[PDB]
Amino acid sequence: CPLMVKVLDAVRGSPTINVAVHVFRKAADDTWEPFASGKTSESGELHGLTTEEEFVEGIYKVEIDTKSYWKALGISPFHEHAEVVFTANDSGPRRYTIAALLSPYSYSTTAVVTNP
Amino acid sequence: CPLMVKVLDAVRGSPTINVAVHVFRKAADDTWEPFASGKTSESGELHGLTTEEEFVEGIYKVEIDTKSYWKALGISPFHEHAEVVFTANDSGPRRYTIAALLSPYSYSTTAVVTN
Amino acid sequence: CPLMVKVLDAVRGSPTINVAVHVFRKAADDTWEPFASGKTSESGELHGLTTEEEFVEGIYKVEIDTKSYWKALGISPFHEHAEVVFTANDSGPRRYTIAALLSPYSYSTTAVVTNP
Amino acid sequence: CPLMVKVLDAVRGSPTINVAVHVFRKAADDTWEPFASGKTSESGELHGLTTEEEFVEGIYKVEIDTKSYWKALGISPFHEHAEVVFTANDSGPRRYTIAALLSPYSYSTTAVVTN
Known about the structure:
The structure is a homotetramer. By secondary structure, chain A is mainly beta.
């Protein structure tokens, strides 16, 4: 509930199914520790990555495997992935939606942050 | 010089060449009267649409014929065109660049306004 | 259900509440006939604009009053509105989500089209 | 000449001036080794990062320090930075322009690749 990822294909106007997503948290050592992973559903959404308790203050990285998505459609895209890095929960708990809009040579990402 | 249009293709990663662009000025009776037009260059740009003398304050519309572009590439598009409607020079003349980034089912338009 | 509009503020990362939306349909005469209107909810969404029966083949125009939104926040934005023009239902009935992402000098719009 | 970065500010409608940009090359041990850096000009552009000789095939990362830009403007940002990771010249050398459009809670990056 605190962290959701949503992915859309701007060529077809359709959610992207089965796209891999990895989340990492920046370590006290400054390394990227694996934190959660999953794949998008038929709606293009990935829920259930974490809980309010586990999702503490930190720097988080959401890495979306956009290249495998395009390659499965026959396309050699520009980007290796889409990677979103942000500080979370530093003013207390929030709910974060990380959205990505994909084209072969472009991507856009927006964050919708709300207070529960 | 006061108005320029620059268009990019997010599918191919290239400027959009030979895209038609039409510019209109809102008339007093709230209709759109045609004002200038052209086709983007090989750099995706359209210069020379108007002059400082002619580009007075008012409401302007820029229409980019995105549907014809995508049809020429054999790609099904969503929109009939991409539009930008804006008020010009409300606080003095400026240079306006209308930058458009095109995908078949999405577009963004940004104004880069320099004094 | 066949037509939904969703609007987000890219400065704050938040849905835009109370934004006016007007829909028009291109006439047999080639005029823009008023078709439906409403305002976005606290989620930034506007539902219930039309029905499958009324929403026939045609060229439709969705006009979002982004300028009033910015002016209420003290900002003089570049665009007078955000206007999305598209052919609908020409290959049969579909569900359309028209999304807009707003900044004072920029907007993005994407269409998500699905088959029920 | 082979790599250029261009950055626009969607809030103010201007190029982003004095934004730091760092470029890295993936090393064989899968770490990022620093390769070039600079600050955007008054046109929002950063030229001269590398040369055709040095810009060989491989995986490159471009980091744009968007957070520092927004902090300088007194605007709260979401992201730590904007990134682009790409494979270069897989089918020959090309000119790459990485165009980034920035808002405090959203960004887009587009590659304009010309031969």
